[PDB]
Write a structure and sequence with these properties.
Keywords: Ig Domains, Immunoglobulin domain, cell adhesion
Helix content of chain A: under 10%
Radius of gyration of chain A: 40 Å
Chains A, B: Down Syndrome Cell Adhesion Molecule (DSCAM) isoform 1.30.30, N-terminal eight Ig domains
Distance between the termini of chain A: 89 Å
Structural class of chain A: mainly beta
Largest interface: A-B, 73 and 71 residues
Entry title: Crystal structure of Down Syndrome Cell Adhesion Molecule (DSCAM) isoform 1.30.30, N-terminal eight Ig domains
Assembly: dimeric
Oligomer: homodimer
PDB class: cell adhesion
Bound molecules: a molecule of 3 linked components (NAG-NAG-NAG), a molecule of 2 linked components (NAG-NAG)
Number of helices of chain A: 2
Shape of chain A: elongated
Amino acid sequence: QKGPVFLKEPTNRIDFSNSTGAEIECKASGNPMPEIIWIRSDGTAVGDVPGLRQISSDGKLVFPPFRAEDYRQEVHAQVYACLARNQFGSIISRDVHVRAVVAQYYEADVNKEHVIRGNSAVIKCLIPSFVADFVEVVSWHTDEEENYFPGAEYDGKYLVLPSGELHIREVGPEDGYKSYQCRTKHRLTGETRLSATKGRLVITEPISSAVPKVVSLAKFDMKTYSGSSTMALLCPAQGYPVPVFRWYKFIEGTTRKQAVVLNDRVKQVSGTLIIKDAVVEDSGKYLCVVNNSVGGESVETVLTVTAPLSAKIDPPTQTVDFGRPAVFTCQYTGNPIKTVSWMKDGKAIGHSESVLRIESVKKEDKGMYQCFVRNDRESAEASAELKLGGRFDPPVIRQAFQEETMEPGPSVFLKCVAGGNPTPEISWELDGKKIANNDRYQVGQYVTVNGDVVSYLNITSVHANDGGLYKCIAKSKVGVAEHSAKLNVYGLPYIRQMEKKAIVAGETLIVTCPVAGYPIDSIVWERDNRALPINRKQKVFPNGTLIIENVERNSDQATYTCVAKNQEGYSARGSLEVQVMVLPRIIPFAFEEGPAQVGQYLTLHCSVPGGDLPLNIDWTLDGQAISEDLGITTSRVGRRGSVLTIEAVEASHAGNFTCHARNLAGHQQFTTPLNVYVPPRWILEPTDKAFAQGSDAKVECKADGFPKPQVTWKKAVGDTPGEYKDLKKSDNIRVEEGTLHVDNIQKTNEGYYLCEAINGIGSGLSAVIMISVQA
Amino acid sequence: QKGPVFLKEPTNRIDFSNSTGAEIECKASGNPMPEIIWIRSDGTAVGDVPGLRQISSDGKLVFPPFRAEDYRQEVHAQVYACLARNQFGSIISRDVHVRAVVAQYYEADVNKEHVIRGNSAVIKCLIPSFVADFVEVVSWHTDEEENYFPGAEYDGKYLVLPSGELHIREVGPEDGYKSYQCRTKHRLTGETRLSATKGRLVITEPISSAVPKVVSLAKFDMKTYSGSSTMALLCPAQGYPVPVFRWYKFIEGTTRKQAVVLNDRVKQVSGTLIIKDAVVEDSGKYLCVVNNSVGGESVETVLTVTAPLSAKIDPPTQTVDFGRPAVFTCQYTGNPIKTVSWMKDGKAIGHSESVLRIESVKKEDKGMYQCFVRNDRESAEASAELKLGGRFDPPVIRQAFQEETMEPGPSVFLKCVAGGNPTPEISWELDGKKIANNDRYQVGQYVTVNGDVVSYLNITSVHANDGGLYKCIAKSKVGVAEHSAKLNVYGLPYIRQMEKKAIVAGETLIVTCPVAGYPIDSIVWERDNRALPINRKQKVFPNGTLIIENVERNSDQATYTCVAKNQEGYSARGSLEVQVMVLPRIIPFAFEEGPAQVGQYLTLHCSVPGGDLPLNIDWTLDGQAISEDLGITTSRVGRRGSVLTIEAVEASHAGNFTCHARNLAGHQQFTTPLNV
Ligand SMILES: *[C@@H]1O[C@H](CO)[C@@H](O[C@@H]2O[C@H](CO)[C@@H](O[C@@H]3O[C@H](CO)[C@@H](O)[C@H](O)[C@H]3NC(C)=O)[C@H](O)[C@H]2NC(C)=O)[C@H](O)[C@H]1NC(C)=O
Ligand SMILES: *[C@H]1O[C@H](CO)[C@@H](O[C@@H]2O[C@H](CO)[C@@H](O[C@@H]3O[C@H](CO)[C@@H](O)[C@H](O)[C@H]3NC(C)=O)[C@H](O)[C@H]2NC(C)=O)[C@H](O)[C@H]1NC(C)=O
Ligand SMILES: *[C@@H]1O[C@H](CO)[C@@H](O[C@@H]2O[C@H](CO)[C@@H](O)[C@H](O)[C@H]2NC(C)=O)[C@H](O)[C@H]1NC(C)=O
Ligand SMILES: *[C@@H]1O[C@H](CO)[C@@H](O[C@@H]2O[C@H](CO)[C@@H](O)[C@H](O)[C@H]2NC(C)=O)[C@H](O)[C@H]1NC(C)=O
Ligand SMILES: *[C@@H]1O[C@H](CO)[C@@H](O[C@@H]2O[C@H](CO)[C@@H](O)[C@H](O)[C@H]2NC(C)=O)[C@H](O)[C@H]1NC(C)=O
Ligand SMILES: *[C@@H]1O[C@H](CO)[C@@H](O[C@@H]2O[C@H](CO)[C@@H](O)[C@H](O)[C@H]2NC(C)=O)[C@H](O)[C@H]1NC(C)=O
């Protein structure tokens, strides 16, 4: 009554210890009640291993407890998958990574950390890389018996970073005394153990002015944090004098960078940036700059925040009639997505796009169609079913005429009684030609009381060469069904006329040499006297049918001939005119790579060589085709070329553009995207101002443009414009919402400040201003 | 007789210890014999500091020995530069980084290294980052008293990597016994000291099949190695079963990669790639892949091999005649080059391309032109001189009128007597406007027996607002020379007319608000009522001149105003119309990438937005422009676009094709090859 559907899959990750053991339950619903077979990475169904791996009832795959010696990679470190299936269809679950890890010994280390008196320290708890996955930092402990846990900052100095390190703010002599050591927990065994080696802070006292330096390799790193956690970006840099750390985030993909906005969610402890409550929007390339009076160094971080994968197919089940299209839409959530791929009753298909579209359904299309959305660490699945339409039964042929041979003279009566719902029309064909009430052929069709169509083909007096391949076609607007059969008439070989076969590039020409007369011996196809099959395109069969695979003009455009001859002498010739028209070849486009800014001049060029003479070239914007009122100038070029000109680009002109060009016996097109961005415009460019002594200076600079611009500021110090340099890093002077927020204005803060509005669409917007003091 | 030239510059880097001291000698040649003044980062000439820094004879800058307390950043951690100069001209040397470092204590550490029995180990000698620059690894020592130096591999197992690490190949139980410790040398103090902490190999039994793992951050790194050294690329990856390491080099810039070719010069020890005798060609993005039966991990390295910077200007000295062009070519070697920049007699110029080209030389162009080629760690300089040729003397102004003020009424007689060879023409200008025999201005010019031009400007009865900045221009076809001077007339403020100033993208607009009347107090420029300093590009001076640097249309195309007002009330307004003309931007082409076969249909499309209205678009084939007989159909597109159609392609149509399109106040073009 219903195909299978997963009610409960196993998780993506199952990690466990050899003393703990593990079980993974896979529950599937269906009708008939499906069996649950477990499968392996390659596709083979997984077997049993007494003691290590057992397949139990209710689709429960069990990995019982075991000893180190009993550990076996094949079983305890393997990619499993649950496959639920009934006689109606099959569905394989998402990937289940089984990782049994034998409870092995590990010891964490904490080594000496060297600091230049004044800089901030990061005491790292070194865990053996090979056990990292299962071991993490829990709490730090000092020899003075102080215990630093994760959470808020202790004494405004000591802070346990999310990533496990102990971050000592502003290291001074009073801290080279304490010996620090970490306490780790193994997330499978459940033991918390202290480090075997205690670290300490070697504090060295500054004499020479040391340029800020980073640990070479530590200059660049990529991190992948789990969703809605607390992320810890570090900027390892020592130096003297004590340097200052500034954080920036690059704008998606570009070389432009915005300064990081400090607040309640994102905070900066010394040089380390802490980001609370992570979201996917926080993903990107982060740059930390570290300056001091001597020099400046910089480090970067490629940060990627995750989001659980989850899939859903619309609709869950659908019933489609034969011949009609079936649509599956895969709806998915999660980040990042590396591979969206489709599947059918276990085995995969070629489709790797969200929407799977069957153009014309048939029997073999029945069953389950799965959609997979997977990445490096996760895999989400979604299921769906296709039922064969029905209670809407297609055309079938019951009492149908069968093969016959005869001598000319007698009346022949062929009958095709076809049934179906709705009641179909029955048309008659002879060797591909539709014959009607022509000559002495009479063709009839009535409907029986039961609702079946009885169609007769009466031939008054079958003639020498009426014989051939007759077929009736039971066609319904719900699908088609045909029945062919051979009628042989005594007589000399006689080949019918063949109207010119007009085929287009690359199509497969299938043609049958329509012979007549029954003692026919040999039907051979010839081109210019040579036997037809002489190249990779051409195939010919003794039944008298020719078939060319990939049609091409100067190759196979010609007048073919078929010769039919009986035993002892008599022969007949037929001449086919294979016309191979040249299908138009559209050459690709290129918009000016700006992209286009509002108020532009865009020129698009559609050029196409191909089928001479008729050339119908049109332009199409997603859904419709150019109403001139809109303001888009479509022109042609002499030899049926085309140029789409758009002066005065507007937002309305944004979207999917397509040159749709067709030519006698073909239709080809090409699509190009058109994005219409907008530059920065001011909505409040600043007002020349003089504040009172020590008043909080609130001067608002603000623009509007697409993409949203960033509002920089700068200052020129000595009462003169020209230096325009970055502001003076202090809580006194802040930038927020594009507003210059300079609290408690100092009498030295006279002079010109300059706000720039930029999104990178055109050159920048800029504004100069003088902020002064009064007392 | 000759401008200065550097015979001996100081090195880019001078590092030294407070007990050792250091001297940097800068020797320069010339005629007259040039003085050698030492300069500082900003451009100021460096002074003396008794005890710490002393400027001695022979251009020797001396940094004598000193005590820790005496160390001072300003002096002992500074960017110095030698400047040699004579009365003929000036030349400043390459940058000299002086880094005095007080002999301070350091202790190297060697910590526990954990390995999965079977994998290869890399025992690292941890040096304090802040002393790295002056401390490197010399040799390793084991508690069993074995000493591993750099060079070839010991016992086919132990190897000291170039970068100082101890690389233990295929670690087995028999090696968790030995305690390893490194011996470092300080390259300034000259002491070699052992590590304060001995490391060891914690060897662990493999039971669980562990996927190869790298140290997260250690997945990506950029290195910059010195030329012709031995480079050491590492691929830190443990795992079980014992994994296999494959190295690849990416093809310059692309996503395609080639497998690294092992031989005698480049060898692979376990997972670490060693490259001997480095060359710039070895620079690139290297990828190490590490696979095993369970999984696969990968690390990358951005490797950059250096090459000493060295510059040379062709020619070293040249003598050019007035009005004629002077060419300097900067020839340089070295890698990488970040900035090729030109300079003149100390102060820099705007040119940042190899070939410096003076289009028309004049007096002020005489002297030295330096070329700099610099990067992050190095800076190479090259010098050159320009002498003034002639025996063909340029225009000079002898008896010239000087500044004056007066009340209106009297007749004024300005005289510019200019000399030169040939005898120049003298034209008169007022505030940028050329005035002739207009109104009651009479302007004359005769030639004296001696061959000097005596040009007079007689104003019949100087009026209220004839006053302003008068200048005479002594122009010769061998060069030019001008003389300006101020004439003040007593009247109310009065600003002249200003014809629309038509400027093109990026040009520098310089404009002076032509006021008249002498008790004038305040000349201020305004845009739409705000005072005109209102965007980066804009500068304004109390003399009443405005100047915009980089002109751009919607930014600064507008009608500017200048207001001039005297003390107590009276004012006058002037309106300038600054127009930004736009130079045409031609969009590139694309022939069908076949290439074209004889008997073809080729369609080429020349599209250009820019200067509205006039648009002259032509097509050019190497040497000439389309004779229609040949069989090439040139068409236009509605809004002055262009389409070159060639049906029936022939051999004659092969060659260099170019769309040459010009627009009022500009000419732009683009070339495409046509290969049949
Ligand atoms: C107001 O009026 C002048 C225009 O009428 C302004 O223009 C500036 O004049 C300066 C001369 O006083 C020039 O300065 C010189 O610039 C050259 C650059 O090539 C230097 O070598 C000189 O050493 C320098 N001399 C000094 C120290 O002044 C400016 O170049 C010029 N600006 C431009 C680009 O036109 C002046 O701002 C001002 N002067 C007066 C007379 O009041
Ligand atoms: C304004 O420009 C000039 C004064 O600013 C005047 O040019 C003057 O022409 C005079 C002709 O009358 C010359 O006077 C002659 O000087 C020579 C010197 O060697 C004597 O021999 C002549 O006797 C004498 N001419 C006579 C007989 O008067 C002057 O050379 C010359 N003035 C000066 C001092 O340079 C113009 O008069 C006047 N107008 C114009 C159109 O320029
Ligand atoms: C799973 O493997 C571990 C390691 O072989 C076993 O745990 C050890 O058990 C022995 C014998 O009782 C103890 O001496 C060790 O101290 C244990 N190792 C640890 C964790 O320190 C464990 O017994 C195995 N599970 C079984 C036998 O099913
Ligand atoms: C402070 O340090 C930063 C980073 O080193 C410097 O910023 C760079 O300056 C150069 C010019 O010298 C620019 O081309 C780079 O784009 C800047 N890096 C960035 C931010 O991407 C800055 O110049 C330093 N301050 C000093 C001493 O000038
Ligand atoms: C440069 O300063 C250093 C640091 O003070 C001096 O080195 C001292 O040398 C004495 C005797 O040679 C030793 O006791 C110590 O190793 C150093 N003092 C300490 C503890 O810092 C050095 O003398 C100075 N250079 C000179 C000679 O002026
Ligand atoms: C060894 O394993 C590595 C894993 O690092 C394989 O390389 C990846 O293969 C995936 C397969 O989908 C590719 O899409 C990635 O581009 C590869 N990642 C990188 C950059 O390493 C590799 O297939 C294995 N080696 C071979 C060639 O068999």
